[PDB]
Amino acid sequence: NSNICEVCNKWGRLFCCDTCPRSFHEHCHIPSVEANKNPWSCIFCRIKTIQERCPESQSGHQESEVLMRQMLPEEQLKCEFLLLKVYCDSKSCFFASEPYYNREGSQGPQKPMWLNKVKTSLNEQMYTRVEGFVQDMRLIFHNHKEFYREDKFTRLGIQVQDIFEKNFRNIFAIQETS
Numbered sequence: 001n002s003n004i005c006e007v008c009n010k011w012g013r014l015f016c017c018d019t020c021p022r023s024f025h026e027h028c029h030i031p032s033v034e035a036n037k038n039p040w041s042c043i044f045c046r047i048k049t050i051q052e053r054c055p056e057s058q059s060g061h062q063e064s065e066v067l068m069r070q071m072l073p074e075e076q077l078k079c080e081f082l083l084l085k086v087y088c089d090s091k092s093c094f095f096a097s098e099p100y101y102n103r104e105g106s107q108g109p110q111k112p113m114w115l116n117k118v119k120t121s122l123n124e125q126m127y128t129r130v131e132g133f134v135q136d137m138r139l140i141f142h143n144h145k146e147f148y149r150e151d152k153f154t155r156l157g158i159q160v161q162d163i164f165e166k167n168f169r170n171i172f173a174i175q176e177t178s
């Protein structure tokens with residue numbers, strides 16, 4: 001197994017996957033690494049199994065159909081994995097915890113949103129459709145762009161949104177277009 005966390009790239013108290021060489025901090029994995037379970041398979045492994053059991057699940061989909069899916073166990077897992085893929089980028093630090101807004105010439109958003117809030121909401125089964133999860137994720141970046149206006153820091157929101165969107169298209173097998 002790897003000797004660093006797959007998500008944050010640090011050493012520490014690591015739980016090792018039984019079916020691949022990845023390792024995780026307890027609360028870096030999503031869902032948090034399960035208490036018992038021998039063997040244990042990480043979220044990467046669980047996603048690969050879904051694909052392997054239903055190869056057709058990789059054929060292209062329309063985003064509008066994906067968003068309307070109910071949050072059954074496989075879609076819950078896919079949104080957990082997509083969230084985890086965003087935490088895998090170090091620039092997610094800027095969006096992880098609760099923001100505050102006091103900048104001359106700007107007003108804070110009406111509905112603040114942040115990664116750990118989405119993480120709690122997934123853990124608490126608060127989303128009934130994929131759309132709920134995706135709307136909160138996109139809101140994070142939209143709030144950031146609007147607040148930071150012409151400051152170059154706006155680019156951090158573009159960068160992390162790009163990571164989200166590329167992973168969304170991969171994980172939910174969105175039909176490729178120009």
Ligand SMILES: [Zn+2]
Binds near residue numbers: 006009024028
């Ligand atoms: Zn970690």
Ligand SMILES: [Zn+2]
Binds near residue numbers: 017
């Ligand atoms: Zn694994």
Ligand SMILES: [Zn+2]
Binds near residue numbers: 054055
């Ligand atoms: Zn099948």
